[PDB]
Design a protein around this nucleic acid. Structure first.
Ligand SMILES: [Mg+2]
Ligand SMILES: [Mg+2]
Ligand SMILES: [Mg+2]
Ligand SMILES: [Mg+2]
Ligand SMILES: [Mg+2]
Ligand SMILES: [Mg+2]
Ligand SMILES: [Mg+2]
Ligand SMILES: [Mg+2]
Ligand SMILES: [Mg+2]
Lengths: 273, 63, 93, 131, 86
RNA sequence: AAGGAGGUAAAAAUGG
RNA sequence: AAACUUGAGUGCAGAAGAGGAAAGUGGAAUUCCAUGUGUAGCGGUGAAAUGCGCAGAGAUAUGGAGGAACACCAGUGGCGAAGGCGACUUUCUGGUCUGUAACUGACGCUGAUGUGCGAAAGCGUGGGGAUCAAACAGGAUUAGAUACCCUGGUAGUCCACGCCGUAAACGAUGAGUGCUAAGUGUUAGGGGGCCCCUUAGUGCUGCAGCUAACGCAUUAAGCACUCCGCCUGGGGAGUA
């Protein structure tokens, strides 16, 4: 899974990478591609509103079926494939009627396997069902928040959640963060855990590789000027020198909560992370 | 003394024979010791396995 | 290789639903080249202890012979997933 | 496993003599039979019988006790061993107990006692001491 | 291995009918057992206790092969090329 | 009746 | 060079087993969370205090979450080379014992160097985290108390994969082989009439013999042979 480079150079020293044994086809489905030009963290005014985005390799977008709303028709896993737009891999599946779609590739999904969606689907990895019909205790991913909108929760590499119980109109789930919350039982989820579990272990190992990934450098607040950052200025190095560390925009940024009050989901969230 | 199984000649114990297992089970459900029931060790092992099978299948109680 | 499979169906089961369940699981135990030597029902029996808050259970006994255990594994998987069978156990002989 | 049948025979004789047994059965061999015959001739044992059965046969020794139940054999010692073999010349032949014992020897002229070895002026492998 | 497979192997490699103790028969059966235990260990790597019996079998087969090579070189060569154990 | 082995409680101020 | 079957293996018929690896299921109990009833204690000790509790603790009832270990059986019982192995079920797999006498015909024993396993703690990566608990904080005892005791409590204790390679890793008793009085248990078998004989273990008692003595004594620490490892006054030192 993880490959460790020999230290042929100081750049390669300690660098590791996925071996990509999972991948079975190294080119994407042409018809499922869309252009994805880079924003570099700049909004519709042309201003940089999110720092440290820019550059990086060119990427094509893969259209992904998060909704899994094609029910009662089997689909055969044509291939596992690399996807530059997400940490997870994607499975090209081919429906018995000939339609081809990408889905998040769950751990253990194999080429040739069959997946289905709907209320009558079996409880096996890659099948998508309403939480109504998913048994308690099952591990799932790609969970919807609104019926028919498509999965939004547990879609990162190795992501999963666990079904805990069934209230009237809601199902209790424990999310990867540890939060326990209610989700409308009419929402869908896919059985299993998102694959590519070793994603988090990769040691990027050099600055250029982050640059390829489109991460521009983070400059620390303490080495700016007072007009730049609350931590700027001071002769020589300086400690924080005030009651709390501050964001570049002057808000406390260590322990200060920022979840907004009077939110609709506050009565659905049973236990925070 | 004499062993019940050795005397009766039965060479196998069925875990669904709750009436027989109740003979060697205690009032609270514990398995009676070999030195008390008189059984041989060979059949004591079989009896213990059968009793645990029945307990698992809820034929017999734990406590 | 013989196998005795004992399972317990919940006591609040309808007659037709229980018949369908027993038939489905017997067929499952028969699928993978496994011959069901004989299946029978011991009726509804008191449980020595409450399982899932049930004081009774419909006891089904099955004997099936096979050269492998694919049928038994499928039965156990579907019994774990099922909310209608409370307990199950497979004995070799 | 077994490594010195002569040693084993001597040790059987020693153990039987200690317990004051009357007879003694051991597996047979030509060398054991010649040793037993030498013992009988010299007077340390009463009798020797050979059973020519399968599996190499058996040697049945009958031990000799004197008056007052005294033991005729005081001790038997293996001299030449598989781990270190001992040979002696005719002029270097040892006297067991200043002559009151025998040293059983193996010679080109058959296994004999040290007295016969000295008489015929020969040496050989010193199988054992007995006294 | 199953007793049926053992019977097949002893029939195949027996020097004469009713021969079960020949070095050829013993070492062929040992080869079959060694291969079966190797296949077991490939899945159950951490089965050191089984692997010890495997090593005992390997040593016994080696000693049989040594004796056979000392007694009859041609038979030894034929057997090793038949079993592919060199 | 007297000796050998295993388990197993309940108690406890400090300094000679 | 040629023969033999007694040793050593193999075949055939049987036996028991917490032997190992991987999945699955289950009851008791502890902790935590939510809720109803309920009042001023709980807990703890030699005695106390810290601590928890008037925000409603502890107790009690119900439900849920999760981890770890498997009450009785259980036994000088069993299995394994040793370490070790104790809920149940399935799959794969190792070893051992009994009888038979086809089968090979000495093919055996030991084993330096080597190559593996190896309790607990410990280390790395990733998980997990109930209980217990180094470190640590507070209380008590005390002349002092870096402790024993009390209240908490982190690593760790658990899992996977690697690493380490050490224990009073002990029977303080190397392996193999044969021989030398007896009595009596127990485990798994076999043969002959509850009894007798017998094989392999596991215990106790006890001759000859051995031993400085204690003791060992067919499971030798007796009598012998083979091979290996190891010792040569106490410290220094398992150090440089
Ligand atoms: Mg940033
Ligand atoms: Mg500056
Ligand atoms: Mg400012
Ligand atoms: Mg300064
Ligand atoms: Mg400052
Ligand atoms: Mg450890
Ligand atoms: Mg403590
Ligand atoms: Mg030692
Ligand atoms: Mg014995």
């Amino acid at each position: 899974a993880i490959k460790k480079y020999k230290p042929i150079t100081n750049g390669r020293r300690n660098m590791t990478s996925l071996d990509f044994a999972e991948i079975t086809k190294t080119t994407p489905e042409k018809s499922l591609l869309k252009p994805l030009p880079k924003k570099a963290g700049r909004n519709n005014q042309g201003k940089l509103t999110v720092r440290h985005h820019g550059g990086g390799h060119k990427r094509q977008y893969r259209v992904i079926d998060f909704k899994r709303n094609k029910d009662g028709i089997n689909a055969k896993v044509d291939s596992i494939q690399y996807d530059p737009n997400r940490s997870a891999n994607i499975a090209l599946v081919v429906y018995a009627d000939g339609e081809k779609r990408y889905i998040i590739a769950p751990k253990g999904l194999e080429v040739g396997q069959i997946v289905e969606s709907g209320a009558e689907a079996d409880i096996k990895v890659g099948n998508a069902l309403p939480l109504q019909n998913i048994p308690v205790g099952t591990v799932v991913h790609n969970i919807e928040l609104k019926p028919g909108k498509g999965g939004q929760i547990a879609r990162s590499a190795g992501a999963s959640a666990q079904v805990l119980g069934k209230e009237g109109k809601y199902v209790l789930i424990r999310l990867r963060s540890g939060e326990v919350r209610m989700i409308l039982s009419t929402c869908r989820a896919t059985i299993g855990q998102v694959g590519n579990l070793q994603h988090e272990l990769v040691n990027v190992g050099k600055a250029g590789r982050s640059r390829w990934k489109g991460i521009r450098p983070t400059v620390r607040g303490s080495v700016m000027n007072p007009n730049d950052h609350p931590h700027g200025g001071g002769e020589g190095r300086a400690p924080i020198g005030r009651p709390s560390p501050m964001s570049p925009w002057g808000k406390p940024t260590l322990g200060k909560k920022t979840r907004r009050g009077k939110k609709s989901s506050d009565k659905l969230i049973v236990r925070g992370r | 003394k004499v062993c019940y199984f050795t005397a009766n000649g039965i060479t196998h114990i069925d875990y669904k024979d709750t009436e027989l297992l109740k003979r060697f089970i205690s009032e609270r459900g514990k398995i009676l010791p070999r030195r008390v029931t008189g059984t041989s060790a060979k059949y004591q092992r079989m009896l213990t396995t059968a009793i645990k099978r029945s307990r698992h299948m809820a034929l017999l109680p734990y406590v | 290789r013989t196998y005795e499979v004992m399972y317990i169906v919940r006591p609040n089961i309808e007659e037709d639903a229980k018949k369908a369940l027993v038939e489905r699981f017997n067929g499952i135990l028969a699928t993978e080249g496994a011959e069901v030597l004989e299946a029978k029902d011991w009726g509804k029996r008191r449980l020595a202890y409450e399982i899932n808050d049930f004081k009774d259970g419909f006891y089904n006994i099955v004997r099936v012979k096979s050269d492998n255990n694919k049928a038994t594994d499928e039965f156990q998987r579907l019994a774990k997933i099922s909310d209608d069978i409370i307990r199950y156990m497979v004995i070799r002989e | 496993t077994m490594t010195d049948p002569i040693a084993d025979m001597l040790t059987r004789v020693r153990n039987a003599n200690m317990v004051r047994h009357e007879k003694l059965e051991l597996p047979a061999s030509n060398i054991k039979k010649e040793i037993a015959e030498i013992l009988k001739s010299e007077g340390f044992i009463k009798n020797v019988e050979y059973v020519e059965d399968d599996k190499q046969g058996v040697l049945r020794l009958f031990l000799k006790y004197g008056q007052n139940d005294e033991r005729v054999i005081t001790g038997l010692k293996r001299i030449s061993k598989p781990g270190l073999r001992v040979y002696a010349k005719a002029s270097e032949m040892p006297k067991v107990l200043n002559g009151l014992g025998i040293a059983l020897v193996s010679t080109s002229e058959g296994v004999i006692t040290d007295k016969e070895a000295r008489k015929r002026n020969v040496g050989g492998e010193i199988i054992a001491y007995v006294w | 291995i199953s007793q049926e497979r053992k019977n097949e192997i002893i029939k195949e490699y027996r020097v004469h009918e009713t021969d079960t103790g020949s070095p050829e028969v013993q070492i062929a059966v040992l080869t079959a057992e060694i291969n079966a235990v190797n296949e077991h260990l490939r899945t159950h790597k951490k089965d050191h206790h089984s692997r010890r019996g495997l090593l005992k079998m390997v040593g016994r087969r080696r000693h049989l092969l040594n004796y056979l090579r000392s007694k009859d070189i041609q038979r030894y060569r034929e057997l090793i090329k038949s079993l592919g154990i060199r």
